[model samples]
Target: IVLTGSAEGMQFDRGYLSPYFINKPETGAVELESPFILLADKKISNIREMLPVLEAVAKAGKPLLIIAEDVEGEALATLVVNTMRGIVKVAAVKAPGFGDRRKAMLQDIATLTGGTVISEEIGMELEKATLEDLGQAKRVVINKDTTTIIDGVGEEAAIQGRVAQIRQQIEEATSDYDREKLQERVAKLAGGV
Candidate 1:
């Protein structure tokens, strides 16, 4: 079964049943169906709730995939790794450098789950890449470093402004010699006279 959600606010979504697997509900009969249960919670406190569902899946001998976001991901991944006794597989989905805090959380989940946090760029490219690697229990690390440069004098203008600010700071410090030396250093760093 698949459960997807954050820890704060978790939602349990039912999966589809195929015609071949349809059966009448009998009393005391355990349902042996492949179900995808998604839990979405925002707070980290709700991670405990996953234990019941995870236990149920374990008893039924079913594979569980828990997808988490943000703080929820961190909590669930750690719980699954340490407490679940290696029965649950945790995968954290994250954007590249969402923030320092979130990145750190994601790193923890990645380490605990033995699964790589799928970054935004790699997630986007999943459609085109061979997904066989995903099935082999290997972590997929995706990093996309896309950058843009401001053209023309705009870039130089930013540098000039920064230099001016530094010059003012130096002047305020009452160090003319230091200010001149700073300007000379700036010029050299800027590849100019």
Candidate 2:
């Protein structure tokens, strides 16, 4: 799912949101907060363990990236992510030659969530992918219905989703300078005017 949260000045510094104004000189115990995709490498199908996480993240409106190991060759297909289950953004893994119901599922995921499935890559890192990466990976979708992942609640989560995405980006931008810049841009978007 392509999350686009950065508004005028809502993103927090380094992804850690803070009140526009603070009280104490010494910061209290704080944890960073940002919306991040639930990366599913291989354990996404686990109902007892992974499924709950999926269920939870699904409810949270986080982007869900499901990479199915690897794809077969010359067998592409459209897959569904979701449309009204919980508004979770869904991105899927790809194949060189995918086909059949499998392809349908995969394609629907990428298409509905506005993501992508590249035929080839050079050191392509799906594991390292973020909402930003998926945003870059999307293909044009003319059709507006059919494929889905988990039956999302609605698209109303777009704003919250983008906020999460920006927060996630800020978290990943661990470099001092970069984190600082990200935090500054993300706060106004997330903290509110």
Candidate 3:
């Protein structure tokens, strides 16, 4: 798995070597194996340290699964999707407007991997529903609406009652689309060195 960003920084950055491996040199192209990890402060340099670990993992015949938050995850996913040749699976754990940028990253990763992206809230609901009832009413409505009710209700039961009443309207208005091409274009624009 590739991790974006230097370990020392508050936010993770993309690993430099990941792109090099995925893009220019397939593992077979290298004549000799060298240490992959590098240590330095510069953006490109610090990620060198992770190289050895990554190489070791690759050698072990394990599939790499990278996970990150916010911009870091998005950056890594964008790079990997464009350069690598494997299915990507992304799970956005939170809804788009839930203030979790990492969710957006996860969405991108899923797109790159050609995997499904389920919102975190939805995933949790699915888990809960799977344990109980998997019907559409139980799985989708009761579980998901409960969260929305809680958010709309705030700390009061009366507010929750009022919010619950509007569930039909809210559910009817929700819509999503693939827009894969748009996503690719956006990734290309943002994926500068």
Candidate with maximal TM-score: 1
lDDT of 1: 0.33
Query: Candidate 3's residue-wise lDDT over 62-142, tens digit each?
Result: 333233222245444553553354332111112222233344433433332222332344543212211111100000101
TM-score of 1: 0.26
Computed on alpha carbons, the lDDT of every model, listed in order, comes to 0.33, 0.33, 0.27
List model 1 lDDT by residue over 103-172, tens digit each: 4333322232233444444452212222111111111111122101111111345446545655675677
Off by over 4 Å in 2: 1-101, 118-123, 135-193
- Looking at model 3, report the run of 10 residues with the lowest lDDT sum: 132-141
Model 2 lDDT at residue 7: 28
RMSD of 1: 21.6
Question: Residue 5's C-alpha lDDT in candidate 1?
Answer: 30
* Model 2, global lDDT: 0.33
What lDDT does candidate 1 reach at residue 116?
44
Number of backbone collisions per candidate? 15, 50, 17
The whole-model C-alpha lDDT of candidate 3 against the native structure comes to: 0.27
Q: Candidate 2, residues 1-193: lDDT per residue as tens digits?
A: 6556432221111211122111122542121123222222222232233334344556665444343533222111111323223344443332212344333333333332344432224343433444433321111111112111222222336535655665787778768876665454344324232
